[PDB]
Amino acid sequence: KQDMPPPGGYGPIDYKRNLPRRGLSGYSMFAVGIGALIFGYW
Amino acid sequence: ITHTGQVYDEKDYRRVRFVDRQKEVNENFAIDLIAQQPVNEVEHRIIACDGGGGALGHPKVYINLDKETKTGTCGYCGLQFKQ
Amino acid sequence: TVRPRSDVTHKQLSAFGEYVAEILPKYVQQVQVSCLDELEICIHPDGVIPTLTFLRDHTNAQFKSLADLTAVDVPTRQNRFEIVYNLLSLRFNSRIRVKTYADELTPIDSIVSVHIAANWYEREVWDMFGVFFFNHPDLRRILTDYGFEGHPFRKDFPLTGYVELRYDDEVKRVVAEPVELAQEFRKFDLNSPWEAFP
Amino acid sequence: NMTLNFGPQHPAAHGVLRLVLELSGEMVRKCDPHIGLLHRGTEKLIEYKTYLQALPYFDRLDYVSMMCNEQAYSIAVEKLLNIQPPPRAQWIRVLFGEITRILNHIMAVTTHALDIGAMTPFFWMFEEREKMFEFYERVSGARMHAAYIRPGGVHQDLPLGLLDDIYEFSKNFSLRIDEVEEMLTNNRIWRNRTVDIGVVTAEDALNYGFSGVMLRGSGIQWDLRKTQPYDVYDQVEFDVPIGSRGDCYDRYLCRVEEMRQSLRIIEQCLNKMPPGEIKVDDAKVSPPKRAEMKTSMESLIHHFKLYTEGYQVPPGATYTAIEAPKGEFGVYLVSDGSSRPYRCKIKAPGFAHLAGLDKMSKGHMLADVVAIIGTQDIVFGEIDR
Amino acid sequence: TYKYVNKVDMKSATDNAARILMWTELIRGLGMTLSYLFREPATINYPFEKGPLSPRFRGEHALRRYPSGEERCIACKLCEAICPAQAITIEAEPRADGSRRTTRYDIDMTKCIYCGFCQEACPVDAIVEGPNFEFSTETHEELLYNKEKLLNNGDKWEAEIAANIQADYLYR
Amino acid sequence: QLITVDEKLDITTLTGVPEEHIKTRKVRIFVPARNNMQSGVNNTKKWKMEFDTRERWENPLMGWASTADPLSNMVLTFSAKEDAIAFAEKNGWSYDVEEKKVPKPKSKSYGANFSW
Amino acid sequence: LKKTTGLVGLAVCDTPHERLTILYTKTLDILKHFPKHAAYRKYTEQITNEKLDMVKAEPDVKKLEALLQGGEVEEVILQAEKELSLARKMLKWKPWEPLVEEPPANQWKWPI
Amino acid sequence: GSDRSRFLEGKRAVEDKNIGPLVKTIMTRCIQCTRCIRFASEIAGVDDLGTTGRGNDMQVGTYIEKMFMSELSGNVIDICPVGALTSKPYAFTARPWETRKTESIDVMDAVGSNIVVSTRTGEVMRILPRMHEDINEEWISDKTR
Amino acid sequence: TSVKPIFSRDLNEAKRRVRELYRAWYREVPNTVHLMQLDITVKQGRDKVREMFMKNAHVTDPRVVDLLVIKGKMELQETIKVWKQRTHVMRFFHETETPRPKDFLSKFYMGHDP
Amino acid sequence: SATRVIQKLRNWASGQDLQAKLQLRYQEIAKRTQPPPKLPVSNNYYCTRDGRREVVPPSIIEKKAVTPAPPMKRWELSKDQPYL
Amino acid sequence: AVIPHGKGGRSSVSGVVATVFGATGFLGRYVVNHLGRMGSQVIIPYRCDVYDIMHLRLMGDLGQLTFLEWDARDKDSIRKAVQHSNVVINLIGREWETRNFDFEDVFVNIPRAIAQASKEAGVERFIHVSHLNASMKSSSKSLRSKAVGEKEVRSVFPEAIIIRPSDIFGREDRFLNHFANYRWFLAVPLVSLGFKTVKQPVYVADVSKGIVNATKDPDAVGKTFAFTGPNRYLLFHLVKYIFGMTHRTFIPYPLPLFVYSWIGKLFGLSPFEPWTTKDKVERIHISDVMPTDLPGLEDLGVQPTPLELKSIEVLRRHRTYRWLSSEIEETKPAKTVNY
Ligand SMILES: CCCCCCCCCCCCCCCCCC(=O)OC[C@H](COP(=O)(O)OCCN)OC(=O)CCCCCCCCCCCCCCCCC
Ligand SMILES: NC(=O)C1=CN([C@@H]2O[C@H](COP(=O)(O)OP(=O)(O)OC[C@H]3O[C@@H](n4cnc5c(N)ncnc54)[C@H](OP(=O)(O)O)[C@@H]3O)[C@@H](O)[C@H]2O)C=CC1
Ligand SMILES: COC1=C(OC)C(=O)C(CC=C(C)C)=C(C)C1=O
Ligand code: SF4
Ligand code: SF4
Ligand code: SF4
Ligand SMILES: [Zn+2]
């Protein structure tokens, strides 16, 4: 007949940002570095 | 020569164009193809001619095949209709 | 098939048109709210900086942005060019048109002082129609070729100009050439002769 | 100082800029952009062409935004005629207007990056743009300069499968935005290249007539889709993404948000598009249907006259502005009673923005100028007209 | 409605210096491009898998012919009076059958804009704008089409045109 | 201010028209005549200023009509004899004004054709 | 109080109530030298008065703003200061005078 | 007039006849406006044309097929607002929007009738009358057309 | 009749500008030939300048001479700067264009147009 | 369709679900050849529905000062996402 | 259609179709530009590769220039090129003798064949270009040969125009340049130090305008012509004029022609293109000619252009940077000779 939205709506699309915060913390990060870097000295 | 003449005179310098080339000329002349068609016999005094289609053919005009003397020809299809 | 319109606007703006005409009686020659619900204050050319300054800096009429400056050329009128300035008020969400008339030889002032947007538009009006803007910083051709002769959007200028360009081997440069067009532009006289009942 | 204009022919001059520059050592003392390199005479030619046969001049003013340029003219010619498009057509123009804002922004954000030096964002988004072109090709017939938003409506109805396919694109497009989002928003390199570059203060932006994301990036609240609504935008809900520091980054972030907000508007248009016809039914303004012109005489006469002569819009003049992706695009159409216009001043968001380049790019080096042009989203068709 | 876009305890201060010194934040971009070499390229094999189109695709012009074999063009001049690029010249005559047909028809395909204002104005469906888009030419003369490079052109794609006309006629 | 000049406003040096198209070219101010083929009088009300007709020739390759008269498609439209003569004099063209030809009033009566 | 007026340039102005009173009061004066019955003096003195009327009737900024119906007060000021400049500029251009010159004939008839 | 049609019925058709070698009467076009009959009887004194039949069947023509041979003949073309009878030589050579119209004078005869020469792309396509109250008041001879 | 002055009031006053442009151009021709690597000789060019400044040597409406200077100065700016390339400047010399004959018999003999 | 390891490579490296949002169209695409449609089409005198003739020529036109229009209502921060 | 029907320029037509055979080199690219700007069709027979005929495609307008392949060995290529023409022009000529073609072929055999077909096809004019001071026993293999052919041309196709140009200068020339090139190798090893030999040099355009005027000039039939040029200069002075204008140091150390003949031999040996050769060396030093009585450029309608004027354009390249910007009045003034 004529293109028209599917009865009951198309559905929901997401538009908002989702850049997902994640990651090691700083205290932990550094402590692996120095821990890998004292072992390099011993 | 195209269905509409155009044939260049031998002297015409406008013939170089086709040297090492050729001439685009349609072999299917509509003057003859339409003559190779059966006069559409009809019963009614007047007849329609949608161009063999509704909205895919030519505007719809009614032709008066009223005189056997002349087979009406829709100005659009060139189709002769034999009363 | 009849525009959905609001009469509130016609009235509100009409009222502003009387306000502007009262506040500036010396420069405004005619104010009219068209039926498209837009306003047009027609000012004497001398009123170009006064009228626009009042609109840019008045609490009851702040018209901060210059939408555009353009010049219709009606060749019949004595003062052919009709410079038209369209302005927008972000504060009151409304728009106004101030239009003044300028002839080929009589320059009008430059509003670059009132709005710095006009620095470019005024250069384009000079290049396109030949109107000159007084005390305008750097007026010079914006759109036409560096050596172009003639003002193009004037109604008396041929569509296709008088000069065209081509590369001439003999001189190894892009040389101009009087215009020869291989197919003149068929000008169609399509305009009905039965006028519409108003 | 040293006069080394940017390149008329340049790998990054957006085609045709000359931008003569004075080089005070590394930094640029002054810029004098020499546009005119693409002035085809669009406004002169329109005076010699009927209102339908001039629509095409418009999709070729800002070729990145095709159908929004047309939507201006179409709104301008409708107001002069005092006719309004049918309800379905108005939603279709808002549906296509938002697809154009996504495609303009994908153009502006990704090309800015390749100028900066980031090359991959362009490729990922351009495949997403070819998907969108296909939507223009599958409704109009062309992938560009469609000439679909004509006076009175759209030229033809949406094909039977378009709205499902627009849902599938909009459904997955959001991930593609933040994929570019993670690539450019937090990188040291992008923020340093973009943050605090070309700051424009609020009053200066209004005075220079910026009127666009350049206006909103500095924090001024103005969209023209919520201030002076056109079509049916008054029935769709969206949030203007205004800015706070009026600089490249804040302006970038605003452009990425409007792509997201446009997906919200496209979502509403698919959900609520009305059954109806796509063009006004007065045959004295929009052509008659193919079946009608081939079966009824009044329709043949109306088709013959409309195509050969024209609408003959009533004498008057109007300035109609719509929020084109770049900024306020307006047509000042002066009309005599004749079928062909008398004047058509295309206000180009871009003539004002490029003027601002000298003020915005002051105390900035050669590399900053490449970012300054990129953040004005200037395409020279609109500026040169 | 408006939306703001861009508007210290040691935990936070170390976190900031762990994202500036041992860069961890340009890494969220390197893994982001590593996420794409392992996906399937979108490239189509071009010459063998031409991209997708629509029956509406406007390309190389062609003059349709009535099945019978009679040219459909009745030289109205309803298609150069609208052609905005001013590209068409269709000088005509009575064809000596008494019928009405062209002796001349023309497009300069270096002026046309593929706008299809000629296929929607034609009251007979003679001039169409076919789905060709591989007709590039090494010369300028091969683009100034005549009535015989448009009619045998239309004597070529008519199997492929009519399907698309019949496919879109209702919407038009 | 208000300096006085004593001459027509010759802007021929400001127009930018190549000399030969400002010298050997005659404008013809006239109110277009009606298309006998129709009876509409709306196309015979405004004075037009059209230029002389120069060579319209044939493009050897395709047979199209070609021309070298830049001012060929030019039909400026004025609203009175006075305003057309002014523009032509303004631009330095030669004019050939043609007075308007409004039909005179012809008395028409239905019954008249019934007399004998 | 307010950390930042949204608009980039306009900077937070402490003592909004004060800055205004001075700017508004100066203006109420510059208008004085205007001809008795000059629309500008008659109207701009009608506005400046109402704003000085609220600038002193309400001491909470956010509140004040709503009343003056402007943007951030840092803006109500920006405007108060510009009207003053127009008021000075107007007293020289003497806009109140009779029209300079009536349009030439038929300089505003569009269907020409 | 009206944007649409309500005539969902069958149209009529008349039979094309030959009125001469100058006038092509595709009279199924005729709106029975009787201008032709009058001109033929009041300007040209040739009363050969006439209405035949009543009802919708009224046909405006020459009952027996006698050609309309007279000078002043071609004016019928210009005077029939419908394109029922039009010019046979200028049958389908052009279409009016294209025709560039230059106003000139008749040289075939010494009345010096005013005429408009309609030229397209540089060859004359038709010469039709332009009104001169005193000399040719809207009419031109069969020779000079 | 009365007319506002564009920049000068009397033709004499204006001519002061016309000369202040001649000088400028004259003192520039030499520079251009060298800068734009043009091939025409300084003398040759300086000739052109006089020709032009001379071509316009008949108008008496100050406003027009007030206007041609401006247009005139603008053309210097571009030429003084190198905003104009060789192509632009050399176009003042109709290098390829075959000068049209003027003799009647010379025109009758070619081209139906006057 | 990709080896799960390779695709988990792209999900882990991207940080986002990636099987869901494909940039490639496999069955997502509507098939062509949609069934033919049937588009939707007294006192309908054009003199009543005249948009073109409805318009009229422009109107030409103690007291209290009047603004061009009531001052624009200031917008308010978005409820779903005030800051992004 | 020999009726020119248009305002002069591209898109007009002067109605003269023409086959200009040597339109791949130096002189024919200017001929096509004038015949072309004169809007006349030009059937340009090219045996080259299309990539090198493109430079010709814009020197004309839509349809004006037509190309077709021709090889001198076979006719029917000469025949179809001249089949629809009315004008024919011969510009064939090669300095060296490639293994496949001798001065015999490029100057006699070939022009003869072309002219053969020219008369056969009915072309009215067979403009032929033989060298000035080029007669039999002119002690140079080519020049002698060239004249032999001039006869063959006249015999087969009488009423032919024969232009005999002097040395032709102009951009991309091999006259001024050969001399200019000497800069690269040592210094000008002129013979007779360059004195005792005088040359009249003519600009390519002057010759090109003449050939075009001749194709369209009625009295030109059966008329030989010598396009000598405005000034006669001694060779030493002209090399010195090439230098100074070239802005590179000049040294006219002398040597004899027997040695020099031997020298170029080796250069000729070069497979691609002789930098110089015996035949060239001869036509430079020994070749000297005083025109006496032959209608000239002025006679045909061209004002010969002096070398004093258009020498920047052809030597401004041979300067080192820092001198490139040098103007003309600065160039070392030259001086003319009579001898
Ligand atoms: C306590 C034990 C005894 C003492 C031990 C020693 C003391 C502790 C040492 C801690 C060292 C921490 C890391 C320091 C080195 C890293 C480089 C660095 O210092 O960062 C500089 C720069 C920071 O950038 P920015 O945010 O602009 O900071 C400046 C702000 N004005 O960084 C940059 O922006 C550079 C960006 C350039 C582009 C990078 C692109 C990504 C590169 C990925 C490489 C992947 C492979 C790396 C490994 C290769 C191995 C061969
Ligand atoms: N200064 C001068 O140059 C002077 C020249 N002349 C005469 O004028 C004529 C034109 O001179 P110019 O153009 O400089 O000479 P070129 O060396 O440029 O050769 C002329 C043309 O002839 C073609 N040609 C050469 N050999 C052959 C061959 N064997 N078969 C087919 N075509 C060939 C060349 O094309 P291709 O690249 O395909 O070989 C070239 O385009 C010459 O014949 C010469 O005798 C006379 C006096 C002075
Ligand atoms: C947006 O402006 C620009 C273009 O126009 C759309 C370009 O084509 C180009 C060149 C295009 C490519 C693919 C290098 C550049 C660099 C550009 O900045
Ligand atoms: S093509 Fe269609 S429109 Fe153009 S002329 Fe032939 S029929 Fe009339
Ligand atoms: S497509 Fe548009 S431009 Fe090309 S021909 Fe048909 S109408 Fe003219
Ligand atoms: S005039 Fe034309 S229309 Fe009126 S009746 Fe005679 S023929 Fe029929
Ligand atoms: Zn039919």
PDB file of C-alpha atoms in Angstrom, chain K residues 33-98:
ATOM      1  CA  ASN K  33      46.515  26.314 -33.894  1.00  0.00           C
ATOM      2  CA  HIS K  34      46.051  28.903 -36.628  1.00  0.00           C
ATOM      3  CA  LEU K  35      44.110  26.800 -39.091  1.00  0.00           C
ATOM      4  CA  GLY K  36      42.264  25.815 -35.980  1.00  0.00           C
ATOM      5  CA  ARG K  37      41.620  29.229 -34.510  1.00  0.00           C
ATOM      6  CA  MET K  38      40.566  29.965 -38.044  1.00  0.00           C
ATOM      7  CA  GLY K  39      38.031  27.301 -37.308  1.00  0.00           C
ATOM      8  CA  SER K  40      38.868  25.157 -40.282  1.00  0.00           C
ATOM      9  CA  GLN K  41      38.635  21.391 -40.144  1.00  0.00           C
ATOM     10  CA  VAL K  42      42.028  19.733 -39.977  1.00  0.00           C
ATOM     11  CA  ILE K  43      42.463  16.059 -40.672  1.00  0.00           C
ATOM     12  CA  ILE K  44      45.687  15.468 -38.842  1.00  0.00           C
ATOM     13  CA  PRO K  45      47.367  12.307 -39.952  1.00  0.00           C
ATOM     14  CA  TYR K  46      49.380  10.893 -37.069  1.00  0.00           C
ATOM     15  CA  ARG K  47      51.655   7.892 -37.026  1.00  0.00           C
ATOM     16  CA  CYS K  48      52.547   8.697 -33.463  1.00  0.00           C
ATOM     17  CA  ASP K  49      51.123   7.365 -30.245  1.00  0.00           C
ATOM     18  CA  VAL K  50      47.983   9.080 -29.088  1.00  0.00           C
ATOM     19  CA  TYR K  51      49.596  10.177 -25.895  1.00  0.00           C
ATOM     20  CA  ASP K  52      51.607  12.580 -27.989  1.00  0.00           C
ATOM     21  CA  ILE K  53      48.774  13.879 -30.106  1.00  0.00           C
ATOM     22  CA  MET K  54      46.756  15.130 -27.159  1.00  0.00           C
ATOM     23  CA  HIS K  55      48.572  18.403 -27.121  1.00  0.00           C
ATOM     24  CA  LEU K  56      46.762  18.969 -30.367  1.00  0.00           C
ATOM     25  CA  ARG K  57      43.282  18.126 -29.231  1.00  0.00           C
ATOM     26  CA  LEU K  58      42.541  21.475 -27.628  1.00  0.00           C
ATOM     27  CA  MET K  59      43.892  23.511 -30.532  1.00  0.00           C
ATOM     28  CA  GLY K  60      40.513  23.285 -32.145  1.00  0.00           C
ATOM     29  CA  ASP K  61      36.874  22.880 -31.308  1.00  0.00           C
ATOM     30  CA  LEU K  62      34.266  20.171 -31.228  1.00  0.00           C
ATOM     31  CA  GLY K  63      34.757  18.178 -34.390  1.00  0.00           C
ATOM     32  CA  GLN K  64      37.175  20.578 -35.986  1.00  0.00           C
ATOM     33  CA  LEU K  65      40.135  18.266 -35.693  1.00  0.00           C
ATOM     34  CA  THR K  66      39.946  14.665 -36.824  1.00  0.00           C
ATOM     35  CA  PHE K  67      42.659  12.132 -36.332  1.00  0.00           C
ATOM     36  CA  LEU K  68      43.547   8.981 -38.205  1.00  0.00           C
ATOM     37  CA  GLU K  69      46.638   6.746 -38.362  1.00  0.00           C
ATOM     38  CA  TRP K  70      48.982   6.938 -41.356  1.00  0.00           C
ATOM     39  CA  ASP K  71      52.270   5.276 -42.069  1.00  0.00           C
ATOM     40  CA  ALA K  72      54.315   6.476 -45.043  1.00  0.00           C
ATOM     41  CA  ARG K  73      55.157   2.933 -46.214  1.00  0.00           C
ATOM     42  CA  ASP K  74      51.488   2.259 -47.134  1.00  0.00           C
ATOM     43  CA  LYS K  75      49.039   4.380 -49.173  1.00  0.00           C
ATOM     44  CA  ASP K  76      45.247   4.440 -48.636  1.00  0.00           C
ATOM     45  CA  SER K  77      46.332   6.079 -45.381  1.00  0.00           C
ATOM     46  CA  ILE K  78      47.548   8.991 -47.511  1.00  0.00           C
ATOM     47  CA  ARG K  79      44.470   8.405 -49.719  1.00  0.00           C
ATOM     48  CA  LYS K  80      41.760   8.476 -47.004  1.00  0.00           C
ATOM     49  CA  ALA K  81      43.406  11.391 -45.151  1.00  0.00           C
ATOM     50  CA  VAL K  82      43.252  13.527 -48.339  1.00  0.00           C
ATOM     51  CA  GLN K  83      39.968  11.956 -49.592  1.00  0.00           C
ATOM     52  CA  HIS K  84      37.565  14.636 -48.231  1.00  0.00           C
ATOM     53  CA  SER K  85      40.043  17.587 -47.930  1.00  0.00           C
ATOM     54  CA  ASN K  86      40.371  20.539 -50.396  1.00  0.00           C
ATOM     55  CA  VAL K  87      43.628  21.871 -48.870  1.00  0.00           C
ATOM     56  CA  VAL K  88      46.725  19.773 -48.265  1.00  0.00           C
ATOM     57  CA  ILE K  89      49.866  20.835 -46.413  1.00  0.00           C
ATOM     58  CA  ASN K  90      53.151  18.932 -46.227  1.00  0.00           C
ATOM     59  CA  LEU K  91      55.429  19.494 -43.221  1.00  0.00           C
ATOM     60  CA  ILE K  92      57.174  16.081 -43.221  1.00  0.00           C
ATOM     61  CA  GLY K  93      60.898  16.423 -42.537  1.00  0.00           C
ATOM     62  CA  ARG K  94      63.487  14.826 -40.284  1.00  0.00           C
ATOM     63  CA  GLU K  95      66.962  16.070 -39.487  1.00  0.00           C
ATOM     64  CA  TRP K  96      68.521  12.654 -39.059  1.00  0.00           C
ATOM     65  CA  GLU K  97      68.098   9.584 -41.182  1.00  0.00           C
ATOM     66  CA  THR K  98      66.573   6.897 -39.032  1.00  0.00           C
TER      67      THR K  98
END
